[PDB]
């Protein structure tokens, strides 16, 4: 500790006083997790390899959930030419559980499939599939020139009168009006049907050949999770500090009984501060209490180097029971002041500890803590008739000091 | 009739646990005091809409209401959501339902056409007023449909009062949530009538609103504040408390807002030779790019940008879409 | 098949204890509330304690209550009755009955918050007998 | 204390209706279910929210509930119909659920 002290003041002599050196905090001694008992694996086979995809302006809609879904072993698959996501990562999907994954499904006439992407303009993003700025998930796309390949059966929107909403679809086919004149029943002037087809041709090069794209979509945390990844349930530790899982809800705490009594729908709880505090446990649906395990400041209680090299260390607002889980003991109510013996005696304060105590070099010598003794007591002699009265004097010089002024820096 | 829905419609609007503390959560409830209508739909059920969210209400005596029609066309056209209460099951289903101009359940609604949704389980409504005798009992639902769910609330208490709702807070707890999808525009009760002639309830509708609930110790809401009800509310609300003290509090900001637009360009008339550049028979050598100011224009860059001719069309400081809005 | 079968019956002394293990099969254990029922020997049917979906609300007859504890592992699908200070009265075969009405179902939220009062289904039995 | 009384038993004719009767103070405000009971078997839920009947159950058993009485009744008795009946006073949020003193239906 003298050490650490000197390191954190930068000097190599350090007064007597009291100084902060570091933080103590409890580590975790184990991992939990504890996913809900979903039953069944997922059916990402029926998407990825379907007989036959839908349109970009008829774009397919499957509602994922009750799922073990493995996103691993599709990361994993060199079909998938492209796999990017824009709210988590492909490696990390397998240890977050989400809530109604939805999974859409078209076809894209080619490269423009980098249209299928938050905040991107074009003719498939604008008027096609328009999907939010803050999407959460992942575009998965390869190329199908030996499935979708001619072929005229797979079409696409080229106008709409407005951009469309996130996740929006657009059934109709009434004539668009592109000029300032009315159009009606047929092509005019300056006036087309809105749709046509790619022409998927094989002889198409690299780039206009037909892409496969499916965009899976995600929430987390908004419902009882449903779309879990595979990881696998551990046993329940309580009254020790320990990082856990629930349901993706990562942490670090001790984990105990709780008395509060949710509601069948509360999955959570959170206090004043709107820091979660509590959780249903997915398995067996009890409710623990989330308490951050101890943490809090160390102090090195040291006279001058000059005089000794002899320490003692406050942890502040530590208990004793718990402070060797990290590394004479004396439990003060500022916390446990370590390797300072108490003694019974009252002495003015010297280092002042806090809530009453003090600490100081005593004599065969070592430091002591005490209460510190706020003066000599003295029973003055009043009485009703009765004045003391000074028969001398002492003229007494006492020299005071005060800063008037500082540095000139600019 | 119309009738005061005093403090309904509050509903617990998270799935978090929260005890003594007021949070000040903003979320489609029904505002304070509102005008709900009253329909006595026996001496009928009409088409109502459901603009952001409904707070349905219910004192029937023999429990005669059994569920509801959501949806926006109602005609097989367009899909739409059923919920209807059998005696031993809830089905709540969405098809593309071709509806009867007046539903209603004998005493045997349903349809298959082109079918997406089907949860067939336990029915929350139930015949429970028998028991209470004459006091009876108050359903209220709340439904909504944001994100894709449709959200339904609901809590049934004793009463006595007749004919309005109760002078009383209770918050209602959530049903299902179910994820839909679907667009909900209109909605209608449907009946059990026991002489099938194939020709109440109080009704309410959402607004967004930020209310602050209050948390007992148990983790109930147990009192709320509407914060755009009155000048007093929005003090409680500012604050963050039910009670104020003696004083003058800062609540809002004042601001006069405008009343029409306007719009003032300079008297040009002439278009402007956008096609002298794009459909010029020679286009220059790279090293000798053309420079042709445009000025004194009525420029349209609306048919510059959903034309298919151009493969490449990115603005950098500028919105393609806005590019006809801003003078330049 | 929905079926409960019960274990951990046999003979025990006043004043000791035991406990009781209702195992579940066949349906989702962690949506019902679950009730256990003795039956002493010739005698009627009587109501031993109920425990919720989640464990959060328990009920005792007044003849065991302080003395047995209900509770259940949703994890395992279990249900169990921890018996204290046992008495001769406490001699009767025990059953463990599920509610004919789910009071929360985790798969998918459903809260009906208005429940038929039926338990159609009830364990085989396990018999306890209290003498010395 | 609670006592749903029942008579100790009903002696019925075979083909004969059968009224077994289940009594308590409180029982109209509170629903009452009803369950049969061969000897050496557990019990089976015949009668639950005082009139209904879960799937299998013959149709011919029915029941009711008002004042201070709730009625099981058959229409007509068959010889397996000789049983233990027990009615049931039900209420979740008072957590009341205790069981009446049982029914020994006799047929000769």
């Known amino acids: 500790p003298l050490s650490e002290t000197k390191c954190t003041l930068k000097s190599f002599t350090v007064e007597k006083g009291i100084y902060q050196t570091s933080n103590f905090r409890v580590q975790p001694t184990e991992s939990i997790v504890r996913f809900p008992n979903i039953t069944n694996l997922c059916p990402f086979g029926e998407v990825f390899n379907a007989t036959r995809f839908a349109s970009v302006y008829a774009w397919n809609r499957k509602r994922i959930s009750n799922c073990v879904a493995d996103y691993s072993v599709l990361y994993n698959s060199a079909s998938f030419s492209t796999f990017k996501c824009y709210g988590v990562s492909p490696t990390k999907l397998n240890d977050l559980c989400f809530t109604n994954v939805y999974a859409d499904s078209f076809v894209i006439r080619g490269d423009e499939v980098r249209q299928i992407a938050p905040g991107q303009t074009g003719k498939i993003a604008d008027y096609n599939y328009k999907l939010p700025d803050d999407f959460t998930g992942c575009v998965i796309a390869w190329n199908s020139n030996n499935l979708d390949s001619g072929n005229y059966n797979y079409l696409y929107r080229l106008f709409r009168k407005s951009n469309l909403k996130p996740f929006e679809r657009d059934i109709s086919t009434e004539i668009y009006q592109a000029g300032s004149t009315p159009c009606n029943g047929v092509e005019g002037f300056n006036c087309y049907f809105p749709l046509q087809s790619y022409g998927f041709q094989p002889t198409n090069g690299v780039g206009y050949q037909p892409y496969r794209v499916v965009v899976l979509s995600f929430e987390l945390l908004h419902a009882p999770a449903t779309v879990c990844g595979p990881k696998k349930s551990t046993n329940l530790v309580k009254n020790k500090c320990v990082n856990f899982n629930f349901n993706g809800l990562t942490g670090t705490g001790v984990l105990t009984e709780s008395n509060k009594k949710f509601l069948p729908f509360q999955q959570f709880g959170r206090d004043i501060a709107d820091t979660t505090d509590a959780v249903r446990d997915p398995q067996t649906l009890e409710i623990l209490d989330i308490t951050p395990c101890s943490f809090g400041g160390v102090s090195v209680i040291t006279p001058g180097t000059n005089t000794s090299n002899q320490v003692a260390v406050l942890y502040q607002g530590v208990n004793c029971t718990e402070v060797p889980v990290a590394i004479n003991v004396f439990q003060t109510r500022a916390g446990c002041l370590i390797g300072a013996e108490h003694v019974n005696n009252s002495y003015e304060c010297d280092i002042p500890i806090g809530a009453g105590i003090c600490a100081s070099y005593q004599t065969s010598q070592s430091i002591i803590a005490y209460t510190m003794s706020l003066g000599a007591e003295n029973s003055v002699a009043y009485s009703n008739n009765s004045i003391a009265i000074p028969t001398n004097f002492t003229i007494s010089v006492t020299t005071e000091i005060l800063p008037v002024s500082m540095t000139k820096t600019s | 009739a119309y009738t005061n829905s005093f403090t309904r419609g509050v509903y617990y609007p998270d799935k978090v646990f929260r005890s003594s503390v007021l949070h000040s959560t903003q979320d489609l409830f029904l505002p304070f005091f509102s005008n709900v209508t009253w329909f006595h739909a026996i001496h009928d059920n009409p088409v109502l809409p459901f603009n952001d969210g409904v707070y349905f209400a219910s004192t029937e005596k023999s429990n005669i209401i059994r569920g509801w029609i959501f949806g926006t066309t109602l005609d097989s056209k367009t899909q739409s959501l059923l919920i209807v209460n059998n005696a031993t099951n809830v089905v709540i289903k969405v098809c593309e339902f071709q509806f009867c101009n007046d539903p209603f359940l004998g005493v045997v609604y349903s349809s298959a056409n082109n079918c997406t949704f089907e949860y067939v389980s336990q029915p929350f409504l139930m015949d429970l007023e028998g028991k209470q005798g004459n006091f009876k009992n108050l359903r209220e639902f709340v439904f909504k449909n944001i994100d894709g769910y449709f959200k339904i609330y609901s809590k049934h208490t004793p009463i006595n009062l007749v004919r309005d709702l109760p002078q009383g807070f209770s918050a209602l707890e959530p049903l299902v949530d179910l994820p839909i999808g679907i667009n909900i525009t209109r909605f209608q009760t449907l009946l059990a009538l026991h002489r099938s002639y194939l020709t109440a309830y109080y009704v309410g509708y959402l607004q967004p609103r930020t209310f602050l609930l209050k948390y007992n110790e148990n983790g109930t809401i147990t009192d709320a504040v509407d914060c755009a009800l009155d000048p007093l509310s929005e003090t409680k609300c500012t604050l963050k408390s039910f009670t104020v003290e003696k004083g003058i509090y800062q609540t809002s900001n004042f601001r006069v807002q405008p009343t029409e637009s306007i719009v003032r360009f300079p008297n040009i008339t002439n278009l402007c030779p956008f096609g002298e550049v794009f459909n010029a028979t020679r286009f220059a050598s790279v090293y000798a790019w053309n420079r042709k100011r445009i000025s004194n224009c009525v420029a349209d860059y609306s048919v510059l940008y959903n034309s298919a001719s151009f493969s490449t069309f990115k603005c950098y400081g500028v919105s393609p879409t806005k590019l006809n809005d801003l003078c330049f | 098949q929905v079926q409960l079968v019960e274990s951990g019956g046999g003979v025990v002394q006043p004043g000791r204890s035991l406990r009781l293990s209702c195992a579940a099969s066949?349906?989702?254990?962690?949506?019902?509330?679950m009730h256990w029922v003795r039956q002493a020997p010739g005698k009627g049917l009587e109501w031993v304690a109920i425990i919720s979906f989640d464990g959060s609300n328990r009920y005792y007859a007044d003849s065991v209550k302080g003395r047995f504890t209900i509770s259940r592992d949703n994890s395992k699908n279990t249900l169990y009755l921890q018996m204290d200070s046992l008495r001769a009265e406490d001699t009767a075969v025990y059953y463990c009955?599920?509610?004919?009405?789910?009071?929360?179902?985790?798969?998918?939220?459903?809260?009906?918050?208005?429940?038929?009062?039926?338990?159609?289904?009830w364990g085989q039995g396990t018999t306890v007998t209290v003498s010395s | 204390s609670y006592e749903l009384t029942q008579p100790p038993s009903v002696s019925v004719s075979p083909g004969q209706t059968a009224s077994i009767t289940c009594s308590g103070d409180k029982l109209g405000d509170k629903y009452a279910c009803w369950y049969q009971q061969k000897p050496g078997q557990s019990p089976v839920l015949v009668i639950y929210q005082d009139n209904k009947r879960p799937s299998g159950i013959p149709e011919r058993f029915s029941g009711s509930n008002s004042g201070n009485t709730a009625t099981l009744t058959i229409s007509g008795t068959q010889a397996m119909d000789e049983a233990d009946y027990y009615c049931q006073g039900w209420d979740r949020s008072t957590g009341y659920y205790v069981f009446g003193t049982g029914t020994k239906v006799t047929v000769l």
């Open positions: 009955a599920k509610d004919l009405s789910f009071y929360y179902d985790i798969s998918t939220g459903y809260y009906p918050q208005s429940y038929n009062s039926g338990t159609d289904v």
């Open positions: 066949g349906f989702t254990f962690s949506n019902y509330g």
